[PDB]
Design a binder for this molecule. Structure first.
Ligand SMILES: CC(C)(C)OC(=O)Nc1cccnc1C(=O)Nc1nccs1
Ligand SMILES: [Ca+2]
Ligand SMILES: [Co+2]
Ligand SMILES: [Co+2]
Ligand SMILES: [Co+2]
Length: 304
């Protein structure tokens, strides 16, 4: 395999971390290949679930807990810390909140969160590499509690970063918020990509096309599929009660991605940097509730 940039995986990986049996597990947690039968049963369907008041309370809870766990990871970002150490802290923080870390064994993913450094677009696997000053790193968190999944992610700066890193991260966050500001009943899911690409393009950045936002609730990834690029064929119109994520991955260079031999790590084909931000949103009668928002601080960590 020919690596696209300077990053290399740092093996060996620690043995998979167990989750106490008292914590409720999603169906794929105990499937040998990590397959989710409940999810697969709806593969290819575009119908979007309309959450009940009960489902909404469950989503509000898990999303708040997920934010708490991402905040824990945020506090650990510093030069010298390995992504496996961040993952260990996330795993324990999920357990402390009586939640199962959704990524764990999802289609056999080996860790409890995704840590994506520099040219890694997404799905980076926590390993032995210590973070380096100047790096940008995304931590993607998803928790499962009482049958509901809550998902969010932020990109962080490791020590002092260059102006290019600052612009990429700020722009990506702005792309996400402009999309969220457009969410309300009656809006087509395909419009979000037009908004995101317009802002990214105005700043000289590209939009990853192989990975999209997704419906999330009783399932980790389900309808609707939400592309972040312009002129996409996303199916569906927003309605109060819909819950889904917006998680644009923006790149310094081209939008093309490829996957490492580990089967998970997605990287830019040109080796340039990529940044991402994500929130889980609930469409209300008039707009949307950002379930994974910070409740005690006005801004994301990179600008805090
Ligand atoms: C094909 C199938 C199984 C339903 O998975 C997905 O679509 N998956 C998906 C879509 C968009 C963004 N992400 C993912 C994903 O897995 N991300 C993960 N994060 C941690 C472990 S797996
Ligand atoms: Ca990255
Ligand atoms: Co993902
Ligand atoms: Co996520
Ligand atoms: Co997501």
């Amino acid at each position: 395999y020919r690596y696209t940039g300077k990053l290399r995986p740092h093996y060996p990986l620690m043995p998979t971390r167990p989750v106490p049996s008292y914590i409720q597990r999603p169906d794929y947690a105990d499937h040998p290949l990590g397959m989710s039968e409940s999810e697969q049963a709806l593969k290819g369907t575009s119908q979007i679930k309309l959450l009940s008041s009960e489902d909404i309370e469950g989503m509000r809870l898990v999303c708040r807990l997920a934010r708490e766990v991402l905040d824990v990871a945020a506090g650990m970002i510093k030069p010298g810390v390995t992504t496996e150490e961040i993952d260990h802290a996330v795993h324990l923080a999920c357990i402390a909140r009586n939640c199962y870390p959704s990524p764990l064994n999802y289609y056999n993913f080996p860790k409890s969160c995704c840590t994506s450094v520099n040219e890694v677009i997404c799905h980076g696997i926590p390993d032995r590499r210590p973070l380096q000053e100047g790096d940008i790193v995304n931590v993607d968190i998803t928790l499962y509690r009482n049958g509901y999944h809550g998902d969010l992610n932020e990109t962080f700066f490791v020590g002092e970063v260059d102006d290019g890193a600052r612009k990429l991260v700020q722009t990506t966050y702005e792309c996400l918020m402009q999309a969220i500001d457009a969410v309300k009943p009656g809006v087509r899911y395909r419009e979000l990509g037009n908004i995101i690409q317009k802002h990214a393009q105005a700043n000289g950045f590209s939009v990853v096309r192989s990975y999209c936002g997704h419906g999330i609730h009783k399932l980790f990834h389900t309808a609707p599929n939400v592309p972040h690029y312009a002129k996409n064929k996303a199916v569906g119109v927003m309605k109060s009660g819909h819950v889904f994520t917006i998680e644009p991955m923006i790149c310094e260079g081209g939008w093309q991605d490829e996957t490492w031999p580990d089967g998970w790590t997605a990287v830019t084909r040109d080796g340039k940097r990529s940044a991402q931000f994500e929130h889980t949103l609930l469409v209300t009668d008039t707009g949307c509730e950002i379930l994974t928002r910070r409740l005690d601080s006005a801004r994301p960590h990179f600008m805090s």
